[PDB]
Motif scaffolding. Structure first.
Motif, PDB file in Angstrom:
ATOM      1  N   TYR A   1      80.455 -29.009-106.047  1.00  0.00           N
ATOM      2  CA  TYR A   1      80.964 -27.623-106.228  1.00  0.00           C
ATOM      3  C   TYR A   1      80.680 -26.752-105.020  1.00  0.00           C
ATOM      4  O   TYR A   1      81.455 -25.798-104.774  1.00  0.00           O
ATOM      5  N   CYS A   2      79.557 -26.953-104.323  1.00  0.00           N
ATOM      6  CA  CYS A   2      79.161 -26.109-103.224  1.00  0.00           C
ATOM      7  C   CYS A   2      79.460 -26.655-101.836  1.00  0.00           C
ATOM      8  O   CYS A   2      79.402 -25.910-100.839  1.00  0.00           O
ATOM      9  N   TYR A   3      79.786 -27.929-101.745  1.00  0.00           N
ATOM     10  CA  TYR A   3      79.966 -28.580-100.472  1.00  0.00           C
ATOM     11  C   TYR A   3      80.721 -29.894-100.730  1.00  0.00           C
ATOM     12  O   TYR A   3      80.136 -31.014-100.683  1.00  0.00           O
ATOM     13  N   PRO A   4      81.993 -29.782-101.071  1.00  0.00           N
ATOM     14  CA  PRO A   4      82.737 -30.974-101.447  1.00  0.00           C
ATOM     15  C   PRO A   4      82.803 -32.077-100.420  1.00  0.00           C
ATOM     16  O   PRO A   4      83.005 -33.193-100.853  1.00  0.00           O
TER      17      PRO A   4
ATOM     18  N   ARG B   1      79.834 -23.663 -89.088  1.00  0.00           N
ATOM     19  CA  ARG B   1      80.177 -22.502 -89.892  1.00  0.00           C
ATOM     20  C   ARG B   1      79.603 -21.259 -89.274  1.00  0.00           C
ATOM     21  O   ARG B   1      79.144 -21.250 -88.105  1.00  0.00           O
TER      22      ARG B   1
ATOM     23  N   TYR C   1      83.000 -20.692 -94.493  1.00  0.00           N
ATOM     24  CA  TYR C   1      83.653 -21.894 -93.932  1.00  0.00           C
ATOM     25  C   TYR C   1      84.930 -21.589 -93.217  1.00  0.00           C
ATOM     26  O   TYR C   1      85.416 -22.432 -92.479  1.00  0.00           O
TER      27      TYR C   1
ATOM     28  N   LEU D   1      84.035 -17.765 -98.365  1.00  0.00           N
ATOM     29  CA  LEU D   1      82.634 -18.014 -98.691  1.00  0.00           C
ATOM     30  C   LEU D   1      82.427 -19.460 -98.994  1.00  0.00           C
ATOM     31  O   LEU D   1      83.257 -20.061 -99.634  1.00  0.00           O
ATOM     32  N   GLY D   2      81.364 -20.048 -98.481  1.00  0.00           N
ATOM     33  CA  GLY D   2      81.133 -21.460 -98.655  1.00  0.00           C
ATOM     34  C   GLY D   2      79.657 -21.764 -98.926  1.00  0.00           C
ATOM     35  O   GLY D   2      78.802 -20.907 -98.742  1.00  0.00           O
ATOM     36  N   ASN D   3      79.382 -22.969 -99.356  1.00  0.00           N
ATOM     37  CA  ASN D   3      77.982 -23.463 -99.475  1.00  0.00           C
ATOM     38  C   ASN D   3      77.130 -22.543-100.292  1.00  0.00           C
ATOM     39  O   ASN D   3      75.948 -22.395 -99.992  1.00  0.00           O
ATOM     40  N   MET D   4      77.651 -21.967-101.380  1.00  0.00           N
ATOM     41  CA  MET D   4      76.857 -21.074-102.204  1.00  0.00           C
ATOM     42  C   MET D   4      75.897 -21.863-103.094  1.00  0.00           C
ATOM     43  O   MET D   4      76.353 -22.515-104.005  1.00  0.00           O
TER      44      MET D   4
ATOM     45  N   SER E   1      86.828 -20.188-103.221  1.00  0.00           N
ATOM     46  CA  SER E   1      87.442 -21.278-103.991  1.00  0.00           C
ATOM     47  C   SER E   1      86.393 -21.922-104.857  1.00  0.00           C
ATOM     48  O   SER E   1      85.275 -22.206-104.409  1.00  0.00           O
TER      49      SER E   1
ATOM     50  N   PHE F   1      85.704 -24.811-108.050  1.00  0.00           N
ATOM     51  CA  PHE F   1      86.241 -25.933-108.811  1.00  0.00           C
ATOM     52  C   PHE F   1      86.279 -25.595-110.256  1.00  0.00           C
ATOM     53  O   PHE F   1      85.472 -24.859-110.761  1.00  0.00           O
TER      54      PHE F   1
ATOM     55  N   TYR G   1      82.398 -14.930-110.308  1.00  0.00           N
ATOM     56  CA  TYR G   1      83.295 -14.351-109.320  1.00  0.00           C
ATOM     57  C   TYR G   1      84.235 -13.357-109.987  1.00  0.00           C
ATOM     58  O   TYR G   1      84.594 -12.347-109.383  1.00  0.00           O
TER      59      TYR G   1
ATOM     60  N   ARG H   1      92.708 -31.242-105.875  1.00  0.00           N
ATOM     61  CA  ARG H   1      91.782 -31.904-104.985  1.00  0.00           C
ATOM     62  C   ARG H   1      91.286 -33.142-105.739  1.00  0.00           C
ATOM     63  O   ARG H   1      91.623 -33.343-106.900  1.00  0.00           O
ATOM     64  N   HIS H   2      90.480 -33.931-105.065  1.00  0.00           N
ATOM     65  CA  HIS H   2      89.906 -35.103-105.654  1.00  0.00           C
ATOM     66  C   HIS H   2      88.394 -35.135-105.515  1.00  0.00           C
ATOM     67  O   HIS H   2      87.868 -34.756-104.473  1.00  0.00           O
TER      68      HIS H   2
ATOM     69  N   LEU I   1      91.197 -26.866-107.855  1.00  0.00           N
ATOM     70  CA  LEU I   1      90.440 -25.880-107.094  1.00  0.00           C
ATOM     71  C   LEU I   1      91.086 -24.520-107.285  1.00  0.00           C
ATOM     72  O   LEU I   1      92.254 -24.375-106.883  1.00  0.00           O
TER      73      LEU I   1
HETATM   74  C1  LIG Z   1      81.719 -20.860-102.932  1.00  0.00           C
HETATM   75  C2  LIG Z   1      81.400 -22.285-102.624  1.00  0.00           C
HETATM   76  O1  LIG Z   1      80.294 -22.771-102.606  1.00  0.00           O
HETATM   77  O2  LIG Z   1      82.581 -23.062-102.333  1.00  0.00           O
HETATM   78  C3  LIG Z   1      82.407 -24.501-101.902  1.00  0.00           C
HETATM   79  C4  LIG Z   1      83.678 -24.891-101.228  1.00  0.00           C
HETATM   80  C5  LIG Z   1      83.698 -25.194 -99.932  1.00  0.00           C
HETATM   81  C6  LIG Z   1      82.486 -25.377 -99.048  1.00  0.00           C
HETATM   82  O3  LIG Z   1      82.287 -26.516 -98.550  1.00  0.00           O
HETATM   83  O4  LIG Z   1      81.761 -24.403 -98.807  1.00  0.00           O
HETATM   84  N1  LIG Z   1      84.962 -25.410 -99.325  1.00  0.00           N
HETATM   85  C7  LIG Z   1      85.459 -25.880 -98.137  1.00  0.00           C
HETATM   86  O5  LIG Z   1      84.908 -26.089 -97.083  1.00  0.00           O
HETATM   87  C8  LIG Z   1      86.879 -26.044 -98.752  1.00  0.00           C
HETATM   88  N2  LIG Z   1      87.278 -27.455 -98.823  1.00  0.00           N
HETATM   89  C9  LIG Z   1      88.431 -27.994 -99.301  1.00  0.00           C
HETATM   90  O6  LIG Z   1      89.295 -27.342 -99.894  1.00  0.00           O
HETATM   91  C10 LIG Z   1      88.645 -29.470 -98.942  1.00  0.00           C
HETATM   92  C11 LIG Z   1      88.388 -30.526-100.014  1.00  0.00           C
HETATM   93  C12 LIG Z   1      88.587 -31.926 -99.912  1.00  0.00           C
HETATM   94  C13 LIG Z   1      88.257 -32.604-101.125  1.00  0.00           C
HETATM   95  C14 LIG Z   1      87.870 -31.739-102.069  1.00  0.00           C
HETATM   96  S1  LIG Z   1      87.866 -30.111-101.560  1.00  0.00           S
HETATM   97  C15 LIG Z   1      86.276 -25.220 -99.944  1.00  0.00           C
HETATM   98  S2  LIG Z   1      86.240 -25.926-101.586  1.00  0.00           S
HETATM   99  C16 LIG Z   1      84.891 -24.877-102.126  1.00  0.00           C
END
Ligand SMILES: CC(=O)OCC1=C(C(=O)O)N2C(=O)[C@@H](NC(=O)Cc3cccs3)[C@H]2SC1
Length: 159
Positions: free
Chosen positions: A28-31, A49, A68, A78-81, A116, A118, A128, A141-142, A151
């Protein structure tokens, strides 16, 4: 919570890398990460990042986030929460999201924050939503097992 924040530091990585408790939480935080999570995986993300920030309470790093994607004058994503397992549901994520919104506004001149989330992560979706993010699209996504997931792509104007 008396919470503070600062940029993430080398010394925080081992702590932060301890936050995801299972393969779902990690996805969920780092796919793109692969379980088990490691400081090297975390460090690689940080390097590619921007805005990696920790939230601190009573001397403990309790949360982490970054961007990200970032587009000056436009938006950040926002990413890696990640939140420490002992501090879930206490407002750390809300706090850090607020921090990151300010950072996007002030440093990137962003008008919008994208998040984004999941589909299986109900707690994220609800948070959110409570923070004023609205759903805009759903992407396929997979997951690591090759299973289809949705997503949910949300955003929020920043002001
Ligand atoms: C708020 C939070 O933690 O979001 C995690 C996230 C990240 C992340 O790594 O930080 N994301 C990315 O870097 C994006 N990645 C994708 O949409 C690609 C994917 C490939 C297979 C599944 S998702 C979004 S998908 C969502």
């Amino acid at each position: 919570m008396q919470l503070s924040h600062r940029p993430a530091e080398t010394g925080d990585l081992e702590t932060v890398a301890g936050f995801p408790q299972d393969r779902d939480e990690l996805f969920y935080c780092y796919p793109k990460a692969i379980w088990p999570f490691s400081v090297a995986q975390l460090a690689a993300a940080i390097a590619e990042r921007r805005g990696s920030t920790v939230a601190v309470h009573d001397g403990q790093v309790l949360g982490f986030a970054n961007f990200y994607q970032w587009q000056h004058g436009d938006f950040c994503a926002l990413g890696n929460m990640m939140v420490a397992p002992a501090a879930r549901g206490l407002g750390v994520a809300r706090y850090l999201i607020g921090v990151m919104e300010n950072l996007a506004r002030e440093q990137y001149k962003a008008r919008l924050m994208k998040i984004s989330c999941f589909n299986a992560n109900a707690a994220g979706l609800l948070l959110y939503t409570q923070l004023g993010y609205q759903p805009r699209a759903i992407a396929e996504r997979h997951d690591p097992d090759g299973r289809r997931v949705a997503l949910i792509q949300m955003d929020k104007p920043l002001e």
